[PDB]
């Protein structure tokens, strides 16, 4: 007979040499699933000791157990308060950091004063602790904290000596002021801004983050105030620690929407913002990602900042895949009418390489580059054909589609190289591609004598095709028959038969009928209808609504800068 019954004895033995060594084992089997609890009291009264090693041990037991059994936790109170007096600042701070972790409406009252004392303890390590304990308690009684004055108590700690405390107070205080938006627990007036615009030059790394994240919410309502506030955070654009760099950028980006373009300052706060977030791309992969998601935002709202900087967003062969993807998007966004030369080259490379799933992403970009840089569409089509000559299937199939849509977006202009492309009807397997080719043959049929057996070959396996090609091929054959009647009298029949009789996709069957009925009873209108210049297709979004973009430039540091969703889409 033993087990747990045996650890209870190992502790009680008044040999504080034995107690010490025994407690060790109990703390060890918490982190191994075993249900302790039967030993709670016996641990508590090991608390009554001097040995700083054995006490910060027992507190692990208590704390990783008041965030679990807060109801069996509060039975230690008289021993927690006792430790709030204890001369040793470590056991003072420890007693506070665990006491607040007891989440139960019943401790609001026990903790009141012990925290009040620790809030103005000699030692800053007790003070830094009590500061976030204030928050840890506003979580269980947001009133009691506004009342017992702990709020004005935090507001004191921001002026505190050592930054380690300031830092925590500024976070706790912002955490509350957020939970109560209207109550203006921060307020931030034009005068008490200088108050914390100074703690920013100290306040450890964290805390400079917490401070900057409060400054976001202020708004000078005065040009001269924004300018003399920006020139006070301009320096924080270096603190390694991308969390600072970004949070400062977040501030700067919101203030700089003040003063149109005069006073070199604006012209210069732009030039001043490039270097830092450029050198953000030189951090660890995870942070590169976060930067990139924000740079994506940034260059949309304020292009001018990362204009010359495109080379930086170029893909390195070993960038983690997520960085690669985000680099590419930004490459697109910076693709200037005066560097697609450089950019396409790069994309061409990416398509040449070996990460297949990105090769695809790369060619689609060449297409997007033809959209964004209107005057370059020709070189794009050039390189797409280069890639196509590679006869590498994954590449071709993605290229023929983009080509398809460049034709649809700029005149025809490329009737030339059309007869060529119909060299690749070899391995067009992917539906989207066949559909693209089948289409190109339909339009542009007057330029390919081939069209007949081109479209015919597709026809031979029609009830096995994509619903997409089936539909595209119906339109392409009809097109042909209005362009070259006779050469194709039999084809239109077969398609229309098959669409109508053989196909059981209802949408298809209809179009079988629509055409057949239109051709046979009014061909002079059939031609008026199915042909006729389609307009130049217009792209899609590109950017973001100017008003929601504005809403997450405001959030440049946060998760909302990563997902591009406003905070309301995660709570």
């Amino acid at each position: 007979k033993g087990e747990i019954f045996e650890l209870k004895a190992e502790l009680n033995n008044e040999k504080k040499e034995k107690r010490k060594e025994a407690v060790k084992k109990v703390i060890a089997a918490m982190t191994v699933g075993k249900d302790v609890s039967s030993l709670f009291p016996d641990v508590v009264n090991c608390m009554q000791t001097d040995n700083l090693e054995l006490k910060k041990l027992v507190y692990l037991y208590l704390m990783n157990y008041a965030k679990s059994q807060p109801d069996m936790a509060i039975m230690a109170v008289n021993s927690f308060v006792k430790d709030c007096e204890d001369p040793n600042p470590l056991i003072r701070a420890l007693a506070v950091r665990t006491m607040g972790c007891i989440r139960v409406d019943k401790i609001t009252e026990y903790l009141c004063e012990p925290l009040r004392k620790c809030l103005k303890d000699e030692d800053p390590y007790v003070r830094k602790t009590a500061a976030v304990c204030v928050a840890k308690l506003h979580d269980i009684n947001a009133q009691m904290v506004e009342d017992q004055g702990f709020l004005d108590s935090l507001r004191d700690l921001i002026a505190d000596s050592n930054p380690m405390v300031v830092a925590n107070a500024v976070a706790a205080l912002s955490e509350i002021s957020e939970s109560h938006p209207n109550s203006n627990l921060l307020d931030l007036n034009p005068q008490n801004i200088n108050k914390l615009l100074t703690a920013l030059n100290e306040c450890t790394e964290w805390g400079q983050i917490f401070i900057l994240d409060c400054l976001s919410n202020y708004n000078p309502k005065d040009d001269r105030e924004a300018q003399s506030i920006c020139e006070r955070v301009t320096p924080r654009l270096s603190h390694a620690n991308s969390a600072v760099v970004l949070s400062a950028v977040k501030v700067l980006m919101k203030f700089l929407e003040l003063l149109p373009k005069d006073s070199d300052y604006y012209n210069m706060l732009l030039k001043k913002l490039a270097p830092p977030l450029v050198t953000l791309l030189s951090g660890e992969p995870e942070v590169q990602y976060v930067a990139l998601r924000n740079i994506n935002l940034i260059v949309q709202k304020r292009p001018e900042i990362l204009k010359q900087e495109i080379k930086v967003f170029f893909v390195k062969y070993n960038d983690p895949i997520y960085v690669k993807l985000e680099k590419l998007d930004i490459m697109i966004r910076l693709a200037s009418q005066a560097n697609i030369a450089q950019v396409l080259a790069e994309l061409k490379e990416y398509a040449t390489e070996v990460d297949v799933d990105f090769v695809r992403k790369a060619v689609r970009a060449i297409g997007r580059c033809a959209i964004k840089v209107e005057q370059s569409a020709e070189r794009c089509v050039s390189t797409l054909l280069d890639l196509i000559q590679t006869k590498v299937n994954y590449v071709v199939q993605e290229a023929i589609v983009v080509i398809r849509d460049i034709f649809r977006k700029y005149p025809n202009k490329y009737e030339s190289i059309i007869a060529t492309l119909c060299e690749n009807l070899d391995s067009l397997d992917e539906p989207d591609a066949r559909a693209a080719m089948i289409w190109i043959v339909g339009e542009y049929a007057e330029r390919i004598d081939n069209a007949d057996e081109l479209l015919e070959s597709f026809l031979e396996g029609f009830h096995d095709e994509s619903t997409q090609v089936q539909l595209t091929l119906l339109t392409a054959i009809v097109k042909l028959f209005l362009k070259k009647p006779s050469e194709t009298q039999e084809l239109v029949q077969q398609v229309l038969s098959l669409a109508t009789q053989d196909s059981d996709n209802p949408d298809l069957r209809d179009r079988g009928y629509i055409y057949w009925r239109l051709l046979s009873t009014d061909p002079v209108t059939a031609k008026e209808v199915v042909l006729s210049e389609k307009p130049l297709i217009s792209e899609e979004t590109d950017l973001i609504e100017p008003t929601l973009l504005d809403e997450l430039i405001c959030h440049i540091g946060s998760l909302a800068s990563v997902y591009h969703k406003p905070p309301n889409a995660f709570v």
């Binding site: 084992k25 398809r404 849509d405 649809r408 289409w439 619903t467 997409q468 539909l471 595209t472 339109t475 009789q501 059981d504 996709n505 209802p506 949408d507 069957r509 209809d510 179009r511 009928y513 629509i514 009925r517 239109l518 009873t521 009014d522 209108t525 008026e528 209808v529 199915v530 006729s532 389609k534 307009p535 130049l536 297709i537 217009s538 792209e539 899609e540």
Partner: protein
Amino acid sequence: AVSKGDGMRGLAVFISDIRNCKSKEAEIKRINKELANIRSKFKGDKALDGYSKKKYVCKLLFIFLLGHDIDFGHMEAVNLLSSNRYTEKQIGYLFISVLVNSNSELIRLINNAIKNDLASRNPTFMGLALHCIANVGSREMAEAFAGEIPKILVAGDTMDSVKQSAALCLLRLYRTSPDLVPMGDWTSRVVHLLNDQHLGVVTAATSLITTLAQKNPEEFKTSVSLAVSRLSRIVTSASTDLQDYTYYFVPAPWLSVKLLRLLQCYPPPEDPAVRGRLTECLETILNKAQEPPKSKKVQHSNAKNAVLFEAISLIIHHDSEPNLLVRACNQLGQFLQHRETNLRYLALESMCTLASSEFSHEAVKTHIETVINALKTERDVSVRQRAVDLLYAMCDRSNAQQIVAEMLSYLETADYSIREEIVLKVAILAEKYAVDYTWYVDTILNLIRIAGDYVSEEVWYRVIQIVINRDDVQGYAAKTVFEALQAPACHENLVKVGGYILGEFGNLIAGDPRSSPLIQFNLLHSKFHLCSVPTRALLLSTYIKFVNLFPEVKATIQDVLRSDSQLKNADVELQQRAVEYLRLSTVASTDILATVLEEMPPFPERESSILAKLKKKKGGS
């Protein structure tokens, strides 16, 4: 009485010291320590005595069964195999049974020990060997002893405990090297084992006879006549007979179940008398099942029902005399009713099998209520499926509306791997067993409604198909669709089915201003700008059919199509549909347009290709 030797302190200690261990790495230290001590007790001058060998080996076997490996001790183990002492032979054989090797020498050193023991005509030893042969089954052994095992098995003077093990040993050899197990003279004299005084023998012989009879049915056909004679004699004589083999008041349940499984390897007894007795015997098994239980202990119940289920499986397997098929279906019926879970599961499984019988008179359909219930109540996704599966296999036109309902509610709260397969099963039963076609239509668009992610294209095509064919539903569908479409989520598959149904019909619900022409177009177009392209294409076809039907809304629809979003549409299919429809709402004669957009014929009743047919007197066509 005789004394009782055994114990091995060294081991116990090794275990305790190890079950001890203030860590998962002291465990690892205490091993290498004992390992190092054991080696260098073998690896020494004086070999050790049996007791010390036996023990150090056992300790190694234990270290292995912990998960550490063993690079030695096999030779010490083979020594043990030669011992006259049982407890020593035992550990040697156990050791080499669990830890085998490719070592050509050990393999044959061992085959020698085994050879000897087999030849010692000492039954305890013969067993130890027979077992090693059967726990190991190495090809190397089948070669050496496959020929001798049968020789033993059928010998008259062979102890019954050895007859048992020999038979199961042979079986393992047969599963190992079917080639080396011929079909000798022992056949008829193994079959004759079914009449052995000893029922443990009969039980073993039966497992062997059952596995041989599956690729050698003809050699063992003689076993049916017997398996019946025994099974009869078993389920008759009460509790005082077959003393040893009665378990919780159920006589030789396991041998029964085995004998009934054996009778399934064959067709109903070819001889009338035998077919009779076998059938009287099942009459009886079912008879005892309905009687007040001899005990209530779950053991008795499980043994009795183990035999009961098998006799039912033999009944379902044979599929003759309806009377037995019906009684079985009624006992399977009663199990479902009895509050439980093991039986509920088994009974549904058995019943579901009983449904592919052609002389039950469909007894299964009588229990629709009992099983619909099982499905309603039972938590436990397994019992819940085996039930749904029964309902699918017993659907006719009579209970389809009944089942489809219960089935839709199981869908509502089902795992997702179940969603798609339930959607089909349901869709099948409805387009197959429907009389009221408003109920088919209504049924299908529930599936679409809530469960829609799991309705495939074939399913929704088909209602559109079916609605175009049947006219007595075009109005009801146009109405019903219009109402399901009022929901703000509604799967995208509803928007497909609905838009089509209102482009064709729905002029025939545009009398009522509840659903005015303009009211419907606004309803569809609200779903447009957030549907897949295919759906938007479909919607566009719908839009122009409206320009035909309802000249009031031509004004409107016309410059939905005229707007950039459509005419400049980035997808080629969408931009075709737009430009064409716009163009023809403009150019076409009001007459010509009405022709082009006429009502689309019925859907051809697509039909099977005959893949094979009885032709030149055989299967394929």
